[PDB]
Design an enzyme around this catalytic site. Structure first.
Site, short mmCIF file in Angstrom:
data_model
loop_
_atom_site.label_atom_id
_atom_site.label_comp_id
_atom_site.label_asym_id
_atom_site.label_seq_id
_atom_site.Cartn_x
_atom_site.Cartn_y
_atom_site.Cartn_z
N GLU A 218 0.74 -1.29 0.15
CA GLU A 218 0.05 0.07 0.27
C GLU A 218 0.82 1.22 -0.16
O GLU A 218 2.00 1.33 0.58
CB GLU A 218 -1.12 -0.08 1.18
CG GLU A 218 -0.20 0.16 2.42
CD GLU A 218 -0.91 -0.37 3.67
OE1 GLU A 218 -0.79 -1.45 3.93
OE2 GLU A 218 -1.61 0.04 4.39
N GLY A 235 -7.05 -5.34 8.14
CA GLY A 235 -8.21 -6.37 8.17
C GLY A 235 -7.53 -7.32 7.03
O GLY A 235 -7.63 -7.19 5.90
N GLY A 383 3.78 -7.66 11.31
CA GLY A 383 3.00 -7.32 12.32
C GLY A 383 1.51 -7.54 12.14
O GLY A 383 1.17 -8.20 11.06
N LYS A 402 1.47 -13.12 6.31
CA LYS A 402 2.08 -12.14 5.93
C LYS A 402 3.38 -12.32 5.51
O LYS A 402 4.16 -11.81 4.51
CB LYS A 402 2.25 -10.89 6.89
CG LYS A 402 0.63 -10.58 6.92
CD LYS A 402 0.46 -9.18 8.25
CE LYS A 402 -0.93 -8.67 8.17
NZ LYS A 402 -1.36 -7.79 9.56
MG LIG Z 1 -5.22 -7.81 10.81
#
Ligand SMILES: [Mg+2]
Ligand SMILES: [Mg+2]
Lengths: 412, 408
Positions: A218, A235, A383, A402
């Site tokens: 992003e 989210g 994170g 992630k």
């Molecule tokens: Mg989250």
């Protein structure tokens, strides 16, 4: 005075990134900068002029072929503005990195310095711009276990959840560093990593013994003329499966009350940040809470824009927007304080920004889904947004989801 | 023709006076800051009957029956009519307009699906002046019958959790012990509220009054706006209480989810009628104070497409998502199965159309009376996460916006 050359490479699409990483391999050990902003890959080599802010923000140095100059550090943003105005710099692309601690420094929040510079801006000596198999030249597999130390992280998340329940702040991003076994090969990691991802920007740099590479999910900020945009993603569910498991995960996200809340609270803070630097009535949500695909994970994403107020410039907007709310927390100052109390290794560039500034644009990508190496450490870091409703186990799994964006594609 | 210009605190009192002086006369009152509008009598009118089978046009020269295949087209025909063009038009749109426009089968109520009226006289109250143009509180027990409503809510939750639809507004009607004094109720209730629009209409033996908390739609030139409010707490305590409830509202995951679901549908509605890329959120999920209750509110805007007019936008936007449900057609069908009295004008719209606007206020927080019924009505947006007891309480919080100010 730079000479330029235009080459049409009669290359198939499949060979475009292989060709870019192959050029990067030729840069060997030299300082360099890689920035992807489709439809272009911008590659810079060497240093013609640099602004360097040291790790504790006490020294600003300008370097060019006339030598080093010390500048006053009354405002890092003013140093940046002075750099961009310089005769060495006007009309050239500038490649930049802004460390996590730039925020504490700008905001008068006490912080323990890390090792990396707070900010650097560089004009390179040579450049290559790749676009659709054409090039313009301007001249003068690691195995990493993401489960390890997962226990200590859950404890950090517990503390955060407990601190949120006590009213200290509303949201905080708690992250973990995964030390890597060796240094990585940047060109190969860029190649394999990139084909496994769909980032908003990609970057890689090497400067003064420090390197980073990543697939930014992003924008912290983009300014084009007077229009400023920020792109809060928050989210998350995995997309580490079949189109069916992924669709089910997408559905499970668009309608999960906890994720929607965490998303919208962040968007409202981004709106408030823009309202601080924009014309009254100009701040609007252009895209509300749509799902964004990011390699191993998918996220709710919004786009927010405004028109800069007459007395504000892109550096004022950057200072407000940094670091992304979605990589720090709410209220921002309280979350920044909390991060420094909870986390035990310096973030350095993690959750910071990579910048490309040119004639028409100030582009700032958020540093997540990235790898970092220097003389002391070689690591990845990820994170998760913690709120009242968060649970340590889900949040540890989320950091692994992630990390799977980069960790499988780390090459030696 | 301006007849008189005679030089705010006396506006309500004056309106009440007109309403009293010229009772037995049809009257239409609309509040849109910084003005109040009052129309009296009927120079021209379009009337769509309760089942949408007949469109009647009436002017001085007499009565006409118009082809009623499209209610929107009847409304367009009225607006271009030589007796209408250039005049302010006061309108109302019943809930069953949607069913009709959508080709969804419905059980007709008693009230008209749509009326549009050009008044014969008008008073405009603006900046310390009126301009003339021409040719005891009743106690109401809002707890009664709450057990039946809770079963209605439980049934909607069941249907939602079965995947039949995502959201529906289930409402309850409270029959009143006696007929109310409309002009006194207007005065007393207005003081206790801060609505986006207020109205009082009297026409053909039916009367309605209310304090609209949000717009269905406003069109000014080519810009269309809609104002979904959804997610509620009381504001019925001390300021400490109320500020605590505002904070609780902004962070309650159930309320935020029901809000954003609605906002996303409103965006989709506007995208259906606007230029690609023009639809934005101008105000995202801010708290809006509405008397006994405060709500999460968003403002969504767009630029109408070259081939779309305000009636195309209205038929997509009506009834408000926040008073019907998601997906809208499924929610409308659910309301019609679940509820047992006709909504009539409840959850419909009041319209004011003039040179510089098509304004449509959502009918909530209102009281209704005809020759058969006298009632107030309120509902709650039900999602998978709703609790029947909370929703009952919420209806009572909403009803407190008008019930205490009902004057006999
Ligand atoms: Mg989250
Ligand atoms: Mg509600």
């Amino acid at each position: 005075m730079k000479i330029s050359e235009f080459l049409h490479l009669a290359l198939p699409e499949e060979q475009w990134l292989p060709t870019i990483s192959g050029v990067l391999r030729q840069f060997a050990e030299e300082e360099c900068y890689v920035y992807e902003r489709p439809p272009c890959w911008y590659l810079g080599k060497g240093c013609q002029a640099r602004l360097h802010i040291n790790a504790d923000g006490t020294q600003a140095t300008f370097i060019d072929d006339a030598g080093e100059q010390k500048w006053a550090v009354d405002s890092i943003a003013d140093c940046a503005r002075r750099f961009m105005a310089h005769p060495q710099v006007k009309g050239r692309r500038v490649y930049g990195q802004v460390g996590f601690n730039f925020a504490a420094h700008a905001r008068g929040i006490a912080f323990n310095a890390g090792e990396w510079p707070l900010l650097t801006l560089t004009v390179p000596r040579e450049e290559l711009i790749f676009e659709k198999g054409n090039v313009t030249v301007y001249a003068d597999p690691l195995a990493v276990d993401t489960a390890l130390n997962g226990e200590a992280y859950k404890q950090q998340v517990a503390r955060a959840v407990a601190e949120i329940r006590r009213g200290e702040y509303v949201k905080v991003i708690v992250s973990r560093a995964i030390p890597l076994p060796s240094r990585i090969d940047m060109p190969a990691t860029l190649l394999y990593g990139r084909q496994a991802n769909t980032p908003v920007r990609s970057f890689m740099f090497r400067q003064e013994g420090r390197e980073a590479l990543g697939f930014s999910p992003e924008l912290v900020m983009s300014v084009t003329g007077n229009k400023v945009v920020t792109e809060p993603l928050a989210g998350t569910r995995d997309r580490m499966g079949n189109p069916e498991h992924n669709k089910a995960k997408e559905a499970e996200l668009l309608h999960d009350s906890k994720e929607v809340l965490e998303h919208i609270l962040s968007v409202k803070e981004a709106i408030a940040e823009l309202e601080a630097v924009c014309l009254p009535g100009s701040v609007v949500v252009e895209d509300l809470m749509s799902v964004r695909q990011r390699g191993s994970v998918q996220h709710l994403g919004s786009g927010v824009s405004g028109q800069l107020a007459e007395n504000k410039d892109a550096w004022d907007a950057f200072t407000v927007l940094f670091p992304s709310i979605t990589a720090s927390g709410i209220p921002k100052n309280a979350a920044l304080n909390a991060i420094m109390q909870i986390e035990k290794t310096p973030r350095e560039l993690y959750s910071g920004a990579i910048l490309l500034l040119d004639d028409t644009r100030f582009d700032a990508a958020l540093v997540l889904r990235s790898v970092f190496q220097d003389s002391q450490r070689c690591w990845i870091q990820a994170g998760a947004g913690i709120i009242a409703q968060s649970t340590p186990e889900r949040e540890l799994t989320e950091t692994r989801e992630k990390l799977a964006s980069i960790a499988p594609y780390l090459m030696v």
